[PDB]
Amino acid sequence: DAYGEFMIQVKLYWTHGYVVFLKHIAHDIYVCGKTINLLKLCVLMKRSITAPLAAHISLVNKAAVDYFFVELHLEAHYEALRHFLLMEDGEFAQSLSDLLFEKL
Amino acid sequence: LQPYRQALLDLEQEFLGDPHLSISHVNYFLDQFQLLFPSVMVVVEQIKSQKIHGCQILETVYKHSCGGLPPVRSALEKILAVCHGVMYKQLSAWMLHGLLLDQHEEFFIKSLKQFSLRVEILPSYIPVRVAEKILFVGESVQMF
Numbered sequence: 001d002a003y004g005e006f007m008i009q010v011k012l013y014w015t016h017g018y019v020v021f022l023k024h025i026a027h028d029i030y031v032c033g034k035t036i037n038l039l040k041l042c043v044l045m046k047r048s049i050t051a052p053l054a055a056h057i058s059l060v061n062k063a064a065v066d067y068f069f070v071e072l073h074l075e076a077h078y079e080a081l082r083h084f085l086l087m088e089d090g091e092f093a094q095s096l097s098d099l100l101f102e103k104l
Numbered sequence: 105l106q107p108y109r110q111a112l113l114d115l116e117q118e119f120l121g122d123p124h125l126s127i128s129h130v131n132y133f134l135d136q137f138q139l140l141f142p143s144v145m146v147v148v149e150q151i152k153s154q155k156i157h158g159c160q161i162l163e164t165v166y167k168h169s170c171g172g173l174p175p176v177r178s179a180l181e182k183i184l185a186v187c188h189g190v191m192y193k194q195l196s197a198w199m200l201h202g203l204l205l206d207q208h209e210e211f212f213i214k215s216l217k218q219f220s221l222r223v224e225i226l227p228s229y230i231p232v233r234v235a236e237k238i239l240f241v242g243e244s245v246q247m248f
Binding site: 043044045 | 196197200201203205
């Protein structure tokens with residue numbers, strides 16, 4: 001539904017935008033869809049319609065976070081950039097700066 | 105108002121069977137509406153004229169259902185039950201979640217302020233004590 005009646009529409013990678021009925025789960029689906037479209041390249045109120053829906057949002061987000069760590073080792077890339085870019089490790093900073101500053 | 109319409113239908117059936125019925129005959133059949141119709145007229149007239157807002161409509165009809173004429177009393181009491189239906193429907197919301205349904209018209213309830221009790225508008229057949237209990241339930245269910 002990109003016809004103009006639906007509130008959501010169709011690197012940075014997604015130009016999907018979003019900008020009375022319960023918007024409390026509507027706006028959540030908009031971000032929960034960006035997550036799934038990224039993983040492909042990797043009283044009156046709703047109380048029986050929101051029930052098979054909010055049960056799916058949390059499962060989607062937590063499994064998507066889980067995939068990064070336990071398959072692609074994203075937690076190791078941080079403690080990898082920390083060794084060089086923060087100059088944590090010895091035998092690298094004492095060898096880079098000592099050679100570079102002799103020139104200037 | 106349904107038996108008045110039904111009575112006029114039956115009147116036409118008898119007119120078809122024989123139309124020589126006198127006018128006083130029709131008066132004789134319809135004497136039981138003859139007392140009921142002038143009485144309720146002042147209740148509905150006061151509702152229009154005074155531009156009543158909020159819960160006071162319930163009190164206005166409840167006061168005239170204290171009379172000693174059974175047709176008038178039963179007839180107004182049924183309307184008050186119909187109007188109880190809407191109040192119970194909003195009460196199903198505010199005690200259970202805190203959400204309102206009726207806007208701009210009072211239903212004698214608005215945790216703390218922006219959910220407080222509006223004490224003054226409250227109907228006359230309802231004590232203040234039970235309003236305190238309702239207020240507790242709504243504030244607490246909103247809290248957790």
